[PDB]
Amino acid sequence: MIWKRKITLEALNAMGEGNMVGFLDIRFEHIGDDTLEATMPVDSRTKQPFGLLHGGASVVLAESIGSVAGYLCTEGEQKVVGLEINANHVRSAREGRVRGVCKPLHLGSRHQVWQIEIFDEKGRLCCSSRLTTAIL
Amino acid sequence: MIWKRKITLEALNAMGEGNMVGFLDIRFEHIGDDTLEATMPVDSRTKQPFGLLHGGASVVLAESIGSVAGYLCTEGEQKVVGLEINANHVRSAREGRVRGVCKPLHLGSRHQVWQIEIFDEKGRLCCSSRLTTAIL
Ligand SMILES: CC(C)(COP(=O)(O)OP(=O)(O)OC[C@H]1O[C@@H](n2cnc3c(N)ncnc32)[C@H](O)[C@@H]1OP(=O)(O)O)[C@@H](O)C(=O)NCCC(=O)NCCSCC(=O)c1ccccc1
């Protein structure tokens, strides 16, 4: 396992309460040995004015999963913040929930790089994102 | 002026009602002859679990301002969608509202590139973002 912190899904989902993660109903659904996965609804809270998933909402999902995964790969009072993030919106979404899957590209002593792919309910890729974190 | 559509600030702000823009109290505040500006609160809707503005929330603001400016530089039934986005989180925001200022880097026939800088209430740069759009 890449993780250094041991956390439960329930405890992970409690982290979002009362901040942006909870307000968008981002739910962590699986902690793998080297992956982290969360879903997010496509509705009035996450759509742009023309009925599509907001490109920024996909990025909120990516930065949420990658930063939390980043945090879980540190120990003690180390913190992890997003330093640079980028994304390509390859397909639009309109309804249902999208699913983000995050895996590590680099786990360094001072920086990390995460890949997050976001899929719709038919399993089609909608967003491909890379997040670089700084360990403080 | 770079705009091809004539829209009022009130009409711009009406676009966000019932979607993510309205949900987050993103408010368009100024249309320049070649800049667009909007603000966004740093609060429970936009913070990450450790009290900072969520890096994804900055990107929601950037993609919101950039995509609308992009749309205003097209005409009739032309649509504008975000294609690629990247952002540098150079300083944390913690309170008040942040202000995004959007300027064109490239305005093309089938694509645009927008620069959006996001400042805190003390005028310090917190996020610097670039959005690439596709015109459909
Ligand atoms: C350091 C990065 C960026 C972040 O991860 P991180 O968490 O921060 O650090 P890591 O723990 O993962 O350890 C990584 C390595 O860094 C070293 N080190 C760490 N801290 C220090 C330190 N305080 N002091 C000294 N060394 C330090 C380690 O010893 C380790 O070394 P090694 O590899 O020999 O075992 C890491 O991802 C990286 O090296 N990316 C490749 C960058 C690249 O090749 N870019 C392209 C080329 S440069 C641009 C260009 O083209 C150019 C053109 C013209 C002119 C000029 C330039």
Ligand SMILES: CC(C)(COP(=O)(O)OP(=O)(O)OC[C@H]1O[C@@H](n2cnc3c(N)ncnc32)[C@H](O)[C@@H]1OP(=O)(O)O)[C@@H](O)C(=O)NCCC(=O)NCCSCC(=O)c1ccccc1
């Ligand atoms: C500290 C960074 C990363 C590097 O700084 P740098 O390269 O050296 O550049 P500067 O020298 O200009 O420093 C600038 C200011 O930072 C201060 N400072 C320096 N070191 C520390 C420190 N150890 N502690 C505290 N402050 C420190 C400096 O003193 C200076 O302050 P000042 O001038 O007033 O005295 C800086 O770029 C930054 O904070 N970016 C924002 C990251 C961000 O908010 N991402 C989004 C949120 S996290 C992801 C997320 O959404 C998420 C979601 C779900 C779950 C979890 C998460």
